[PDB]
Amino acid sequence: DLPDLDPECRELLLDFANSSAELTGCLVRSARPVRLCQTCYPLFQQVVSKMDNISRARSLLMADRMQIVVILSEFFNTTWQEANCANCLTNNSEELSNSTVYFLNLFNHTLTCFEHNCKNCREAYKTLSSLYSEMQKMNELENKAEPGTHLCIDVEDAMNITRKLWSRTFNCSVPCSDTVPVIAVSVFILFLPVVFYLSSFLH
Amino acid sequence: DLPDLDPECRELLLDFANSSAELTGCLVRSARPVRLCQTCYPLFQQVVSKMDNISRARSLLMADRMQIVVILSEFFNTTWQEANCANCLTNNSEELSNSTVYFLNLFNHTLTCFEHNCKNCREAYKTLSSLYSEMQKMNELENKAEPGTHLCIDVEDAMNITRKLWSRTFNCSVPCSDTVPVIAVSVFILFLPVVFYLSSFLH
Amino acid sequence: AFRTVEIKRWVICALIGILTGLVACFIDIVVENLAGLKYRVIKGNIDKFTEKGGLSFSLLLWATLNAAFVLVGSVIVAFIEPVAAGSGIPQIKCFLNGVKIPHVVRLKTLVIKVSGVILSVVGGLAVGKEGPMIHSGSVIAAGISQGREYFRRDTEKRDFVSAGAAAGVSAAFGAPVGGVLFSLEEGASFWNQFLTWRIFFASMISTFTLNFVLSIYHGNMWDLSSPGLINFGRFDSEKMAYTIHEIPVFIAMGVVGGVLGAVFNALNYWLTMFRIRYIHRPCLQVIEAVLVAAVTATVAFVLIYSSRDCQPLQGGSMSYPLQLFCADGEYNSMAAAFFNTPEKSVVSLFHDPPGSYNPLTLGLFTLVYFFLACWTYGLTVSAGVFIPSLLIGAAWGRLFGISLSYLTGAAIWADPGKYALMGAAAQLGGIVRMTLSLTVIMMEATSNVTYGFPIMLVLMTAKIVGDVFIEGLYDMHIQL
Amino acid sequence: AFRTVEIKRWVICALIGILTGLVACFIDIVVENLAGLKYRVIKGNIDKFTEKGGLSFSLLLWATLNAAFVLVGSVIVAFIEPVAAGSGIPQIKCFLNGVKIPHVVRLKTLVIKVSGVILSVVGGLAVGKEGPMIHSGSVIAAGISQGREYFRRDTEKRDFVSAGAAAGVSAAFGAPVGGVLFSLEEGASFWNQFLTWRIFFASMISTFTLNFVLSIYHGNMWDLSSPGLINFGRFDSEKMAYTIHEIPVFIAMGVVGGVLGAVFNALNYWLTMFRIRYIHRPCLQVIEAVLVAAVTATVAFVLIYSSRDCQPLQGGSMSYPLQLFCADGEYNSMAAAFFNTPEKSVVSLFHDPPGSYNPLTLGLFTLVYFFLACWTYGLTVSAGVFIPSLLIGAAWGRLFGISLSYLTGAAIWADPGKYALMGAAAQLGGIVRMTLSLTVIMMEATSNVTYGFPIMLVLMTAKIVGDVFIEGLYDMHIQL
Ligand SMILES: *[C@@H]1O[C@H](CO)[C@@H](O[C@@H]2O[C@H](CO)[C@@H](O[C@@H]3O[C@H](CO)[C@@H](O)[C@H](O)[C@@H]3O)[C@H](O)[C@H]2NC(C)=O)[C@H](O)[C@H]1NC(C)=O
Ligand SMILES: *[C@@H]1O[C@H](CO)[C@@H](O[C@@H]2O[C@H](CO)[C@@H](O[C@@H]3O[C@H](CO)[C@@H](O)[C@H](O)[C@@H]3O)[C@H](O)[C@H]2NC(C)=O)[C@H](O)[C@H]1NC(C)=O
Ligand SMILES: *[C@@H]1O[C@H](CO)[C@@H](O)[C@H](O)[C@H]1NC(C)=O
Ligand SMILES: *[C@@H]1O[C@H](CO)[C@@H](O)[C@H](O)[C@H]1NC(C)=O
Ligand SMILES: *[C@@H]1O[C@H](CO)[C@@H](O)[C@H](O)[C@H]1NC(C)=O
Ligand SMILES: *[C@@H]1O[C@H](CO)[C@@H](O)[C@H](O)[C@H]1NC(C)=O
Ligand SMILES: *[C@@H]1O[C@H](CO)[C@@H](O)[C@H](O)[C@H]1NC(C)=O
Ligand SMILES: *[C@@H]1O[C@H](CO)[C@@H](O)[C@H](O)[C@H]1NC(C)=O
């Protein structure tokens, strides 16, 4: 009974292997234009349900040194938690988290307005940045954490792409042009101890 | 140019995704009756060659926070090094390491001799255990390491299965039956200080 | 007989430990809330005027907030209780060595020094708040053994104020045994074994009192994860290793720390004799503190405004980050050095992974903070000189670490965090020159023993190379 | 004038540090090779006789190998140089306190003690080899300042033998500052500041000498990763935390250590007065050492033979593993406690993750090793009592940790490694009762400062609860 397997446990392992191969496929299909928590949430629920299906059996997890099923499931959980995909789903799962579908709609809106050939479509971008900061503050009072905690990765990379277009490529930031009041006030306040120390020296 | 991808880089990512999905499939097809370094060495060379193909490009690795391609490649390397599959290949790769094909042939020989329905096929098992200890000592002079370093995982799980059959199931170890010389010598040597301390007390 | 006398002594040492811990957590809580309020006002005012012009009103708001807080602090100090100025460590050191400067025996001095150090760290000066914690513990211990008995004796009073100074050091740096050896380096007229246990009892009970009240101020009552007002802990990564490649490097860094400590002491000596000669009326002292707070605010704002290094926010590197002229989503980096408290910029310099600091930004911050701390020290405010010295040393120690990481091929042994530690110990031993008490304190606060021998070498080298030029700071201010 | 005298003193302290380091690495190298040879002979002989009967010849081979090595060691000790027996720490402690026992001023005593401690750890007795390292350093330092000058003076000789004893402690435990405070607890007739620097100079140069020669014996000359003959290092995981849940637990464990230390001292007191009364001729002493080596060999073999806990080999838990009656591929577990050197069974007890030790196997090993070390200590061999005490304490401390892990629901704070550390400190303070030097040594060797206060509490509790019954071991053997 030892070197071979129970046929239902073999079928259970085959089911997990098929589901996990599909998930690794989904994770790398959507690799650089990041849609990791957008296109692979149902496959992730599929994989974690098959892993829960195995441990209701005993031979699959802890009967070898590597525990290749367990370290694969742990790798998918580490990729899930590092991505923080729970913000791209509602608290009851398998939905798309109504805070974020508005953001993806505005992100698509902003890029389609960027497709119009300079600085014309700005208030869409300002609405996007205000929405992103609003979701960042939302991600510290509902889920309590440190300042600057990481949002859901496709949201965060959408905002990454928008800011890299807006600053590094389009070169539009409307600079300050208020240096000379700052330099006037600064040379005044730095000249104030010269006046004080010389006047106290001469008295 | 930012939110979409270069079409050849898209094709490169698609190739890596196909190859890595096949590898995760191979790792879990061969999960419990462990043949990890026996059936997935060419797929591993395939995946590491596509990962080397990407980094000859720049957008695929370090242009997002997660670096899902890089952490996937690092996971396959960690699974490779923990398995120690380099002992199941020759030093020039893509072969089957002539030390170990003899072991797998004898392992199959030993199990086919176990299929003959008590203690009859023993010298095959003793040859197997002598061969396993010989490969363990071979894995400390050619590849210098600590005593009891881990061998290649399908070899080590084959020997695991054989020893669990031979001891926990068949219950055959031909016990010592030499207790009474040990207990005679032990009560003699423990009675020796009683003689010494009493004789020195009475003198 | 004598047993009730020794129980009276030990219960008095327990009370001065508990009271010094309560004073330490009072300082930390009020400074944290008030500096949070002030920096939130300024960060909320810079971001309003970042676009659409302006931004000179932000500089005036920063300068006048600094000026208002230090105006309150110096009218309190320079008018009412003039000996409350400075850290008071020279006065306590000569109190233990025997000579009694007046107006240390009053509770008014405790109130003025605690209120002054609250209003000076908040005030934006280059001030550490664990300088005068030793003097506050000393006057608590002296005030316990007085009226408004056989404890008014000068043999009994000196031992109690020794225990109070040890409790001040332990509540300051998180160092119980460091507080013991600080109290024994001065006034070591005997090795009374029961006195050292009294000192250690008050010291350990002060650190545990500060743990308990600061953790109940935080979430968990059961945590106790803040042993002192500064806690640059956890040096037990692979960056803990000191190696035979680095012992002459540490001796050379001690030489540089001793040289720069001599420069600090000499410039402050000429400055303080100018202040004895001319700026000696109380009204002139108040005006001078107002201008130096306004100047450190405006030179911080000129350095922030004229900087181009922009790095994105890693999770806790920036307390109140502002993007001045950087792109969206990237925050300013020089503004992380003047908006962080000096007790957190030191920890960041000890712990950030390499390549996280610009050499130009850190060099400019080092040079300006060196001259600012040298100017701000000899003032009529309640002000330490520890964390200014420790931040100067951590900053140029990190510059040394970046230089060693560039000269070698980014070697494992040339980690800038460890060299920031050794630089901080070098400058604190170059400016102050206490030999063994910093070795025990910088072992205790980092929770590492393998930094015992190289820090001890660095402190000896800094002390020797420093004493061939000019005396230490805490000994110079008994010689005016 | 006096400057050349102080250079003579410092160069003499440098030589005694270097020579004590060379003697320490000589002991470690010869013990490692000879015990490797002896245990490879026995493991090669048990595996031959495991099947096909026999296995009583293995017991005779073990007993006669132990008997032969200790017969050589005791004919060397009990016939030639009778004061070389024991650890010699009571003789050095009373040497520093003033009284001069004869035959410590000879190089013959150094040769007999070094050869005896080589032939006793190899001989299989319950002996630690860093007991007599202090006496070996002491006689090296005394022999440097003699003939076959103004250093034969008793003021100059006592200070040099103080430096030699400190170098012995530092080469033993890897503790430079621990060696300093060991030398200052005895003969503290003054606080000569230049004497303490001389002591620390010899101490640190002895530890660095042992690093250099042991690392060139190993692969890397540049490594220096063996500060002493015992190095149970790296307590900086999440198992470093001591918490408010555990301070009364540590006080109770100190009580248990003090009680068991009183039991150890009392049983050894009755045993050693029996040895003064009757077994006092040298030939009877040699025969008694031969029988006690044969008995510890055969009770180790009875405990190995009659054990059923079998665990597979994790990568370095077993030095010379033998499968006696276990299945193939699983090795014996009780044989990991009698075949490991006692300097490695302590490290394993400090560092193995929880659930790696049977309570029945460890309890049987604890009980037998307690009575074996108590019997073996008062003998005519060159023998410490440190690592016997430290292994007894680590073993019952780990049993306490397993009990606390069972009573609570396998809590994070009830890690058996930390309680093994506190048990080892408890028993070493119950049997020996040195107060502060073990606090500094057990801080230094573990490289953790947060184990300063709880180890200090445990040592005080063990000393007090121990002294209400019977005096300490090193003080009892000046009173016969
Ligand atoms: C030979 O086969 C046996 C199967 O009986 C293997 O024993 C099992 O090995 C795994 C791997 O260490 C053990 O899993 C462990 O589980 C605990 C939680 O229970 C976890 O904390 C550990 O980190 C690890 O995952 C398992 O307990 C152990 N025993 C059983 C009964 O399953 C053995 O490893 C095989 N030997 C080799 C060389 O492959
Ligand atoms: C926004 O987009 C930029 C792309 O320009 C992202 O910057 C890149 O982020 C990665 C992740 O930290 C950096 O990779 C790092 O590489 C070094 C070795 O060079 C390695 O030691 C680190 O552990 C990490 O893997 C990369 O340097 C960085 N910059 C560039 C030019 O690629 C940025 O992370 C994006 N922001 C967010 C919030 O996604
Ligand atoms: C396995 O999972 C599927 C879907 O998650 C479920 O329908 C099925 O009942 C599970 N198997 C068992 C035996 O519960
Ligand atoms: C994976 O899912 C959750 C999320 O990390 C985790 O708590 C759970 O234990 C994991 N399941 C496994 C490893 O089977
Ligand atoms: C925007 O969304 C629509 C439907 O939601 C989709 O058809 C379109 O491709 C999106 N735009 C881009 C640029 O992807
Ligand atoms: C990608 O890999 C394949 C096989 O490893 C190889 O034939 C091909 O040349 C590689 N691509 C490039 C651009 O080198
Ligand atoms: C994977 O292959 C080797 C083996 O670990 C490793 O050295 C290499 O850096 C890895 N390649 C990656 C992560 O691209
Ligand atoms: C033994 O090997 C042969 C060919 O190598 C194979 O056909 C057979 O199935 C193997 N036996 C077992 C039990 O797998």
Swiss-Prot record, chains A, B:
Q: Does the keyword Phosphoprotein apply?
A: yes
- Ribonucleoprotein found in the keyword field: no
| TM ranges | 182-202
- Where is this protein chiefly located? membrane
Provide the topology term for how it sits in the membrane: Single-pass type I membrane protein
In the record, biological process GO terms are:
osteoclast differentiation; transepithelial chloride transport
Q: Which ranges sit in the Lumenal compartment? A: 1-181
Location of this chain's protein in the cell? Lysosome membrane
What glycosylation sites does the entry record?
Answer: N18, N53, N77, N91, N98, N108, N160, N171
**Cellular component terms per the entry's GO annotation:** chloride channel complex; cytosol; lysosomal membrane
- Sorted UniProt keywords: Glycoprotein, Lysosome, Membrane, Osteopetrosis, Phosphoprotein, Signal, Transmembrane, Transmembrane helix
Q: How does it assemble?
A: Chloride channel 7 are heteromers of alpha (CLCN7) and beta (OSTM1) subunits.
Family, per entry: Belongs to the OSTM1 family.
Q: What is this protein called?
A: Osteopetrosis-associated transmembrane protein 1
Which organism is the protein's source?
Homo sapiens (Human)
- Of the parent protein, the shown chain spans 76 to 306 of 334
Curated annotation (Swiss-Prot), chains C, D:
UniProt function note: Slowly voltage-gated channel mediating the exchange of chloride ions against protons. Functions as antiporter and contributes to the acidification of the lysosome lumen and may be involved in maintaining lysosomal pH. The CLC channel family contains both chloride channels and proton-coupled anion transporters that exchange chloride or another anion for protons. The presence of conserved gating glutamate residues is typical for family members that function as antiporters.
Q: Which disease is it linked to?
A: Osteopetrosis, autosomal recessive 4: A rare genetic disease characterized by abnormally dense bone, due to defective resorption of immature bone. Osteopetrosis occurs in two forms: a severe autosomal recessive form occurring in utero, infancy, or childhood, and a benign autosomal dominant form occurring in adolescence or adulthood. Recessive osteopetrosis commonly manifests in early infancy with macrocephaly, feeding difficulties, evolving blindness and deafness, bone marrow failure, severe anemia, and hepatosplenomegaly.
Tissues of expression: Brain and kidney.
User: Does the keyword section mention Coiled coil?
Assistant: no
Q: Which cysteines are joined by disulfide bonds?
A: none
Please report which protein family the annotation says this sequence is part of.
Belongs to the chloride channel (TC 2.A.49) family. ClC-7/CLCN7 subfamily.
Regions that enter the bilayer but do not cross it: 89-96, 160-172, 176-184, 417-431, 432-434, 435-446, 447-450
Q: Where in the cell is it found?
A: Lysosome membrane
Question: Which residues does this entry assign to the site Mediates proton transfer from the protein to the inner aqueous phase?
Answer: E186
What is the residue range of the motif Selectivity filter part_3?
384-388
Which organism does this record belong to?
Homo sapiens
Changing L96F does what? In OPTA2; uncertain significance
Q: What gene does this protein come from?
A: CLCN7
The outcome of changing R198G is: In OPTA2; uncertain significance
Q: Choose any GO biological process term that the UniProt entry carries and state it.
A: response to pH
The reaction(s) catalysed by this protein are: 2 chloride(in) + H(+)(out) = 2 chloride(out) + H(+)(in)
Its quaternary organisation is:
Chloride channel 7 are heteromers of alpha (CLCN7) and beta (OSTM1) subunits.
A Gene Ontology cellular component where this protein is annotated is:
chloride channel complex
A Gene Ontology molecular function term for this protein is: chloride transmembrane transporter activity
Q: Where is this site: Mediates proton transfer from the outer aqueous phase to the interior of the protein?
A: E130
Q: Where is this motif: Selectivity filter part_2?
A: 128-132
Binding-site residues, chloride = S87, F386, Y474
Chain positions of motif Selectivity filter part_1: 86-90
The protein depicted here goes by the name H(+)/Cl(-) exchange transporter 7
Task: State the signal peptide span.
Answer: none
Outcome of mutating G219R, per the record?
In OPTA2; uncertain significance
